[PDB]
Amino acid sequence: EKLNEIGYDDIGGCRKQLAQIKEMVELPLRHPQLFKAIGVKPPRGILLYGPPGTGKTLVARAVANESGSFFFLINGPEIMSKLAGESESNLRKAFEEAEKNAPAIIFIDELDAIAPKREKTHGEVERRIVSQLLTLMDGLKQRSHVIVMAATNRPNSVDPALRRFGRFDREIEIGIPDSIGRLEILRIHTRNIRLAEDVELEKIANEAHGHVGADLASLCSEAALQQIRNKMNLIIDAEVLNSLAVTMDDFRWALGKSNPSALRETTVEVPNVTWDDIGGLENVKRELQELVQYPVEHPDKFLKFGMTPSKGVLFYGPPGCGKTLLAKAIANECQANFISIKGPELLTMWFGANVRDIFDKARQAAPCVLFFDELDSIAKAAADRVINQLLTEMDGMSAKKNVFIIGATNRPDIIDGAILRPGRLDQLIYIPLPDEASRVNILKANLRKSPIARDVDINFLAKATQGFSGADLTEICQRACKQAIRESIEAEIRAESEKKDFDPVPEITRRHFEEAMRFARRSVTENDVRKYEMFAQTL
Amino acid sequence: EKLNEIGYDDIGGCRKQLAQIKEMVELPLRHPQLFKAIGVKPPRGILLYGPPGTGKTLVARAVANESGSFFFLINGPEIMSKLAGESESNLRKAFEEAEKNAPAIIFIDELDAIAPKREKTHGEVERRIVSQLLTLMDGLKQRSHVIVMAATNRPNSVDPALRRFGRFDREIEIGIPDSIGRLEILRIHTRNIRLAEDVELEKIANEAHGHVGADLASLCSEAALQQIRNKMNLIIDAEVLNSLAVTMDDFRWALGKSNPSALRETTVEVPNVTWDDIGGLENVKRELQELVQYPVEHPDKFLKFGMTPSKGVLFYGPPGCGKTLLAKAIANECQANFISIKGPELLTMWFGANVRDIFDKARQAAPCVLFFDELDSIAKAAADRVINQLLTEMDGMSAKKNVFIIGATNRPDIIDGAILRPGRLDQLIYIPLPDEASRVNILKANLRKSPIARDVDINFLAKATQGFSGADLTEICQRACKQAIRESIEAEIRAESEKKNKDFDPVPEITRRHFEEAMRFARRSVTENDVRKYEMFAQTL
Ligand SMILES: Cc1cc2c(C(N)=O)cccc2n1-c1nc2c(c(NCc3ccccc3)n1)COCC2
Ligand SMILES: Cc1cc2c(C(N)=O)cccc2n1-c1nc2c(c(NCc3ccccc3)n1)COCC2
């Protein structure tokens, strides 16, 4: 009987959308007088879409329960699992009961099942039920106090006729939870499971990438199974039963063996790469501040001076110089959402229309940076369709919506000149090989989690490199760590053999870094650097 | 019960169409004696089409109510939601009840639902309804005084059989409202909502691009919701309730977060770019006047001299010289509609016939200037299909309908010579880099909204920038504005630091210094070689 007690606190990583739906639904159903007085018309149909398992199904019940409304549930499979007349009778009865017991919420859990695309019907009963649903949606009066909520995997799966301005006009996306949402879901799912004192659910939430709420429930279940195995493979005994608590190692094992279902779905989040970490690149700092931070933080100045900000940059520069991190940092300084799209991903999804989906999602998000990772794959100069999609979508993106498109290219001389036209992406910014401070910061980011020895002078390594790209520094650090692991394992084997300095190699010593450096080679030739300098004028 | 009172004043941005429909429907059904005497036959079927949310659904009721006729409504979803026999029984009862209570209007709301394309039926019950609808539409007796009206998203969706000369012969398009129509919509949706005295609804309309009437209802709803947020967050005191009025800052917030449904719908409007703003380019003014204005303003002299005007023009010149604006300006001087089509758009829509749709809309519009920007992406010399469609449409377009096709190209040498034949696009006009007079207006147009300091000599900059293209001038001003914003934001930060230690506006205008810095890095974007190449094209062809 927990259904009647499902509240907002019992739903996981949809805090922003939960607040939005609260404002949309609860307030009109709790204080109709205010909205009627001012004139606001509460929404008729709210469609929720997103990856499966997010928890969008519980949102309608939570809203109804905490607003005191009546809740009638319409399950698409249930209505489509009945005869030709009984399904229509059930739809009509649901709407009639909702009208009788207003204020009320009708929840169509699988709207895609009831009303798929008209091309997929291939029947008369299905089209009849679709038309009946349309009529009932039109039947509901503006002042009946019945709010029809719906859930679907993808909004494009619903018949377009249902998305008219009178039937389903508001669409809210319940996407993949962030780390805070993941922690909330894990806390919700562990209220009954007994947890050991050594579990840090924050770390588990931060590590689980691509995990939706159902995936986290599976994670907790598998962790409990692992604990039972550990305490049962050796051993029924009441004392042992009371000593059964999920330890952190069990959670780590479950996470390692967990195959999340939302790894392939794009993430929208505010990156935590503060510009204090990027270090130098201060010319790029100033340019990106002028191009992104000022339009978002101080719209008043732009309105005062009557300048429409340009919403398009191109990050051209040698490979492995942290263009993605620069985009993330400029997103963070503005507290702007960040969306990262790789060329292979776009081509693969096109092979499997979705160019407009990502821009629509960017519009959904608050002021955001839409970072395309390799634009030569799309703008080579099959791809002739994606290029035009992108160009037209940029040509239709109003400059006042605060969506900044930042495309990165290692090879800028191949990009089609159409993209670089004024008003599309005409803000060429050059990202050079990291300077001294940038190199120190790269080496410190690489060695953040690695215990280094005090004798190691990171500043000396940065000074010595003087030309290495970022990937080169990462390779140097990885070589040093590999040699350290090689020494640790050799010492462990020697200790085992001698059985017939508890930790002989606890930190990476200066010798490891020296040996790694001896074989280091520059990856960006001076000719390449000269070539990238001339592109600013060759265009 | 407001349905019985829906008039013409309660519908939004369809002022032109409503007047057209008023003559078509209200006048015959009000004075049948006059039309019968001369011999006019009032229309049988009027198919209203356009993007969703325009307000075409209320037109039938407004026409019926004002003319006193009987209004019987038919809903596509409703009829197709019933059994095989009841759906047909309702169609026949709708027309049977209409003839009984004539004069009357039958409004089919979703004609695409009842009568989709014959290839989409894939059933027997559905195909019986289509045929039943056809029979009823052909059973009207031209004296029954019953007028059928229909609404559809696109006319091509309807079964072609319904669009014969006896069933649905008149099609009226209710499209995206223009700025005046947006204000009509923004004033009918605000009759009940209380508004603050600081609200200038005219400004919101001119900024609401791509907003259909339904979308403008979301703006008002969102704007009022914003006011509740502001007052509720500060907070149900009755005094506060009476002080709840939508302020303009709320509207601007709503407009920023509003995602209009019709941003991708093409616009038909008369541009406001008067030729007095284009400045010079006077050798282009004479040629454009001889080809667009005189045929439209003075048809008499063309008939008197027996000359058929050439309906095609090609604009070729260096990039960023305001070719589009010149096309807009001549349209304004003729009060002609202007349709701008981009090369990328035509290919994108073709991948997703539509060439014939652009021309058909041009024909429906009053004397029109159909601009084809980037005609080098279509006439490159997939695309082979689009060029032929464009090539055939021009040939099949009678020169007497006052529709002019202007094609702008930055690279004319690539254009296929088929388009440049004497039949369709036979006139070439060269738009050069802006001259001294024009460069003054380009700078003025850019700095129209920007408060400039009196020490700035706009004339001096134009004299200095002899050779700069239009985009080069625009870049200079933006750099001036960009730098001006920087000195304003840094001054604010310095003020904050000084405030902690203890000229209201530090930089109120773009000083002469800001322009000086921008000009130093400014570089010409059209090489002297490129200018020479364009000159030789007139003879190379
Ligand atoms: C771990 C790592 C690899 C890498 C690479 C690379 N091709 O291996 C390139 C650029 C930055 C890189 N970082 C890196 N990663 C981070 C930071 C940071 N700071 C310096 C920097 C940043 C952007 C840009 C330049 C230099 N650098 C600071 O934020 C945390 C992560
Ligand atoms: C804002 C703007 C940008 C721009 C560009 C450009 N490459 O961005 C090219 C030509 C004119 C341009 N304008 C512009 N825009 C306007 C005007 C005007 N001056 C006269 C003119 C027109 C076309 C041509 C020459 C000179 N210039 C005057 O009418 C109002 C709008």
Cβ within 8 Å, pair A422-B474? yes
Is the shortest distance between the CB of B279 and ligand 2 below 6 Å? Answer: yes
* Biggest CA pair distance of chain B: 91
Closest CA to B9 of B187, B220, B212, B210: B187
Phi and psi of A322, rounded to 5°? 65, 45
Instruction: Kindly report the protein residue whose alpha carbon is nearest to atom 22 of ligand 1.
Output: A278
Q: What is the chain A residue with the closest CA to B262?
A: A396
How far apart are alpha carbons A351 and A343 in whole angstroms?
A: 12
* Distance (Å) from CA A222 to ligand 1 centroid: 36
Beta bridge partners of B49: B152, B173
How far apart are alpha carbons B433 and B513 in whole angstroms?
A: 27
Cα–Cα distances in angstroms (integers) from residue B232 to residues A244, B237, B255, in the given order: 49, 11, 21
Q: How long is chain A?
A: 539
How far apart are alpha carbons A401 and A389 in whole angstroms?
A: 19
Chain B residues 49-68 within an 8 A CB cutoff of chain A:
52-53
Residues of chain A positioned with their CB less than 8 A from the CB of B53: 164-165
Beta strands in B118-164 (DSSP E): 146-152
Phi and psi of B443, rounded to 5°? -65, -45
For residue B303, give how far its alpha carbon lies from the nearest alpha carbon of chain A (Å): 43
How far apart are alpha carbons B252 and A40 in whole angstroms?
A: 17
Residues A170/A175/A178/A180 CA torsion (nearest 10 deg) = 60
How far apart are alpha carbons A378 and A347 in whole angstroms?
A: 8
How far apart are alpha carbons A390 and A316 in whole angstroms?
A: 19
Q: Please tell me which of the candidates B113, B449, B489 has its beta carbon nearest to residue A294.
A: B489
Residues B456-481 as b/e (b if ≥16 CB within 10 A, e otherwise) read: bebeebbeebeebbbbbbbbbbbbbb
Cα–Cα distances in angstroms (integers) from residue A31 to residues A28, A145, A147, B459, in the given order: 5, 12, 15, 61
A234 three-state secondary structure: coil
Chain A contact present for B243, CB below 8 A: no
Structure tokens at B261: 């449904």
Q: Please tell me which of the candidates A27, A31, A305 has its beta carbon nearest to residue B485.
A: A305
Sheet containing strand A368-372, edge to edge, reads: A337-341, A368-372, A403-409, A312-316, A428-430
A170 three-state secondary structure: strand
Structure tokens at A407: 């495309």
Taking the CA atoms of B200, B204, B206 and B211 in sequence, report the sign of the dihedral they define.
negative
How far apart are alpha carbons B133 and B147 in whole angstroms?
A: 14
Q: Collect all residues with Cβ–Cβ distance below 8 Å to B304 and sequence separation of at least 6.
A: none
- Hunting for tokens 């990156």 — which residue is that? A271
* Cα R_g (chain B), whole angstroms: 29
Q: Collect all residues with Cβ–Cβ distance below 8 Å to A156 and sequence separation of at least 6.
A: none
Q: Relative to the alpha carbon of A431, which ligand is closest? A: 1
Phi and psi of A82, rounded to 5°? -130, 170
How far apart are alpha carbons A37 and A27 in whole angstroms?
A: 13
Contact (CB, 8 A) for B326 and B285: no
How far apart are alpha carbons B178 and B210 in whole angstroms?
A: 9
> Which of A165, A305, A425 best probes binding to B when mutated, by most B CB atoms within 10 angstroms?
A305
Phi and psi of B170, rounded to 5°? -105, 120
Structure tokens at B495: 């003020």
CA A6 to chain centre: 26
Chain A contact present for B187, CB below 8 A: no
Q: How long is chain B?
A: 541
Beta strands in A139-234 (DSSP E): 146-152, 170-173
Chain A contact present for B3, CB below 8 A: no
Is the shortest distance between the CB of A325 and ligand 1 below 6 Å? Answer: yes
Is the shortest distance between the CB of A260 and ligand 1 below 6 Å? Answer: no
In single-letter form, the type of residue at position A309 comes to P
How far apart are alpha carbons A40 and B229 in whole angstroms?
A: 12
Residues of chain B positioned with their CB less than 8 A from the CB of A27: 228
* Cα R_g (chain A), whole angstroms: 28
> Which of B203, B216, B228 best probes binding to A when mutated, by most A CB atoms within 10 angstroms?
B228
What count of Cα atoms within 13 Å lies in the side-chain half-sphere of residue A537? 6
Q: Are strands A146-152 and A170-173 parallel, antiparallel or unpaired?
A: unpaired
Q: Relative to the alpha carbon of A280, which ligand is closest? A: 1
Contact (CB, 8 A) for B46 and B148: yes
How far apart are alpha carbons B337 and B340 in whole angstroms?
A: 10
Is B57 among the annotated ligand-binding positions?
yes
Cβ within 8 Å, pair B264-A396? yes
Chain B contact present for A88, CB below 8 A: yes
- Hunting for tokens 């001896």 — which residue is that? A518
Cα–Cα distances in angstroms (integers) from residue B368 to residues A54, B271, B340, B360, B371, in the given order: 52, 11, 11, 11, 9
Give the N- to C-terminal CA distance of chain B in Å, as an integer: 69
Closest CA to B484 of A281, A398, A294: A294
How far apart are alpha carbons A27 and A63 in whole angstroms?
A: 10
Q: Collect all residues with Cβ–Cβ distance below 8 Å to B400 and sequence separation of at least 6.
A: B308
Sheet containing strand A45-49, edge to edge, reads: A70-74, A104-108, A146-152, A45-49, A170-173
Chain A contact present for B301, CB below 8 A: no
Which long-range contacts (C-beta less than 8 Å, at least 24 apart) are formed by B410-413? B410/B316, B410/B317, B410/B318, B410/B319, B410/B374, B410/B376, B411/B376, B412/B314, B412/B316, B412/B376, B412/B534, B412/B537, B413/B533, B413/B537, B413/B540
- Binding-site residues of A for Mg(2+) sit at 57, 109-110, 324, 373
Beta bridge partners of A341: A372
Q: Relative to the alpha carbon of B410, which ligand is closest? A: 2
Region of residue B210 (left: phi > 0; alpha: psi -120 to 50; beta: else): left
How far apart are alpha carbons B66 and B30 in whole angstroms?
A: 10
Method used to obtain the model: cryo-EM
Contact (CB, 8 A) for A208 and A262: no
How far apart are alpha carbons A81 and A192 in whole angstroms?
A: 35
Phi and psi of A195, rounded to 5°? -115, 140
Taking the CA atoms of A57, A61, A66 and A67 in sequence, report the sign of the dihedral they define.
positive
> Which of B2, B75, B81 best probes binding to A when mutated, by most A CB atoms within 10 angstroms?
B81
How far apart are alpha carbons A368 and A361 in whole angstroms?
A: 10
Phi and psi of A146, rounded to 5°? -105, 125
Chain B contact present for A417, CB below 8 A: no
Residues of chain A positioned with their CB less than 8 A from the CB of B82: 128
Beta strands in B112-252 (DSSP E): 146-152, 170-173
Phi and psi of A116, rounded to 5°? -70, -175
Contact (CB, 8 A) for B491 and B506: yes
Chain B contact present for A388, CB below 8 A: yes
> Please, is B508 exposed, middle or buried when counting C-beta atoms within 10 Å of its C-beta (0-12, 13-18, 19+)?
middle
Taking the CA atoms of A441, A443, A449 and A455 in sequence, report the sign of the dihedral they define.
negative
Residues A101-139 as b/e (b if ≥16 CB within 10 A, e otherwise) read: eebbbbbbbbbbbbbbebeebeebebbbbbbbbbbbbbe
Judge if the upstream peptide bond of residue A103 is cis by omega within 30 degrees of 0: yes
Secondary structure in 3-state letters for B273-313 = CCHHHHCCCHHHHHHHHHHHHHHHHCHHHHHHHCCCCCCEE
What count of Cα atoms within 13 Å lies in the side-chain half-sphere of residue B498? 6
Instruction: Kindly report the protein residue whose alpha carbon is nearest to atom 31 of ligand 2.
Output: B445
Instruction: Kindly report the protein residue whose alpha carbon is nearest to atom 23 of ligand 2.
Output: B322
For residue A91, give how far its alpha carbon lies from the nearest alpha carbon of chain B (Å): 12
Closest CA to A121 of B122, B75, B79: B122
Is the shortest distance between the CB of A434 and ligand 1 below 6 Å? Answer: yes
Q: Please tell me which of the candidates A35, A164, A306 has its beta carbon nearest to residue B450.
A: A306
Cα–Cα distances in angstroms (integers) from residue A42 to residues A129, A151, B214, B322, in the given order: 26, 19, 15, 46
Q: Please tell me which of the candidates A39, A161, A166 has its beta carbon nearest to residue B192.
A: A39
Task: Let me know the angle formed at the C-alpha of A243 by A241 and A244, rounded to the nearest 5 degrees.
Answer: 70
B140 three-state secondary structure: coil
Task: Let me know the angle formed at the C-alpha of B473 by B471 and B479, rounded to the nearest 5 degrees.
Answer: 100
Contact (CB, 8 A) for B376 and A418: no
Structure tokens at B194: 């209380």
Cβ within 8 Å, pair B481-A305? yes
* Distance (Å) from CA A206 to ligand 1 centroid: 20
Taking the CA atoms of A438, A440, A441 and A446 in sequence, report the sign of the dihedral they define.
positive
Q: Collect all residues with Cβ–Cβ distance below 8 Å to B515 and sequence separation of at least 6.
A: B456, B461, B476, B480
Closest CA to B465 of B432, B438, B427: B438
Chain B contact present for A518, CB below 8 A: no
Cβ within 8 Å, pair A161-B113? yes
Cα–Cα distances in angstroms (integers) from residue B380 to residues A353, A395, B384, B478, in the given order: 25, 21, 9, 34
How far apart are alpha carbons B381 and B387 in whole angstroms?
A: 9
Taking the CA atoms of B467, B470, B473 and B479 in sequence, report the sign of the dihedral they define.
negative
Contact (CB, 8 A) for B432 and B287: no
Chain A contact present for B386, CB below 8 A: no
Closest CA to B45 of B64, B25, B27, B61: B25
Neighbouring CB atoms inside 10 A of A223's CB total 26
For residue B488, give how far its alpha carbon lies from the nearest alpha carbon of chain A (Å): 8
For B325, the enclosing helix (H) or strand (E) is: helix B323-333
How far apart are alpha carbons A54 and B171 in whole angstroms?
A: 47
A495 three-state secondary structure: helix
In single-letter form, the type of residue at position B106 comes to I
Secondary structure in 3-state letters for B27-81 = HHHHCHHHHHHHCCCCCCEEEEECCCCCCHHHHHHHHHHHHCCEEEEECHHHHHC
Cβ within 8 Å, pair A398-B342? no
Judge if the upstream peptide bond of residue B103 is cis by omega within 30 degrees of 0: yes
Neighbouring CB atoms inside 10 A of A155's CB total 21
How far apart are alpha carbons B483 and B509 in whole angstroms?
A: 11
Closest CA to A362 of A342, A344, A336: A336
- Resolution (Å units): 2.8
Region of residue A245 (left: phi > 0; alpha: psi -120 to 50; beta: else): beta
* Distance (Å) from CA A516 to ligand 1 centroid: 19
Closest CA to B150 of B23, B280, B258, B43: B43
Give the N- to C-terminal CA distance of chain A in Å, as an integer: 69
Contact (CB, 8 A) for A106 and A148: yes
For residue A409, give how far its alpha carbon lies from the nearest alpha carbon of chain B (Å): 23
Q: Please tell me which of the candidates A34, A127, A395 has its beta carbon nearest to residue B342.
A: A395
Neighbouring CB atoms inside 10 A of A537's CB total 7
Is the shortest distance between the CB of B271 and ligand 2 below 6 Å? Answer: no
Cα–Cα distances in angstroms (integers) from residue A313 to residues A281, A421, B73, in the given order: 16, 11, 53
Residues A273-310 as b/e (b if ≥16 CB within 10 A, e otherwise) read: bebebbbbbeebbebbbbbbbbbbeeeebbebbebebb
Break-preceding residues in chain A (C–N over 2.5 Å): 235, 352, 381, 500
* Distance (Å) from CA B531 to ligand 2 centroid: 19
Secondary-structure percent of chain A, ordered helix, strand, coil, rounded to 5: 55, 10, 35
> Please, is B520 exposed, middle or buried when counting C-beta atoms within 10 Å of its C-beta (0-12, 13-18, 19+)?
exposed
How far apart are alpha carbons B150 and B50 in whole angstroms?
A: 12
A222 three-state secondary structure: helix
Contact (CB, 8 A) for A376 and A417: no
Residues of chain B positioned with their CB less than 8 A from the CB of A132: 77, 81
Closest CA to B373 of B314, B293, B414, B286: B314
Secondary structure in 3-state letters for B349-412 = HHHCCHHHHHHHHHHHCCCEEEEEECCCCCCCCCHHHHHHHHHHHHHCCCHHHCEEEEEEECCH
